[PDB]
Design a protein around this ligand. Sequence first.
Ligand SMILES: [Cu+2]
Length: 120
Amino acid sequence: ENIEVHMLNKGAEGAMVFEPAYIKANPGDTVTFIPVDKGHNVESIKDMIPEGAEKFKSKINENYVLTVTQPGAYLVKCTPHYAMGMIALIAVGDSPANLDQIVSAKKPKIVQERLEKVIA
Ligand SMILES: [Cu+2]
């Protein structure tokens, strides 16, 4: 199955957001990222993707289709707006083994605060 995600300047959680910011998927699913507003992309955060997953980075303003294989948690960001809290959490399969590690990792406070809310 496919899950559509919008990249917006302003959404429910404030400025610079991914909607939804919490994506539940299974191996083989696709996640389609649509930059509804310009100035956004999607990029995997180093050490915040499952062991064995492929690192990825889309072009600013491009529709990006990500195929998810490896089970686990993935924290993606918008390159330009990471520091403003523009992130999404992809959970592939049940009980992602690296989720606690990701929650604990060093990241901007705003990011930290948005992550804590998506998880809740
Ligand atoms: Cu952005």
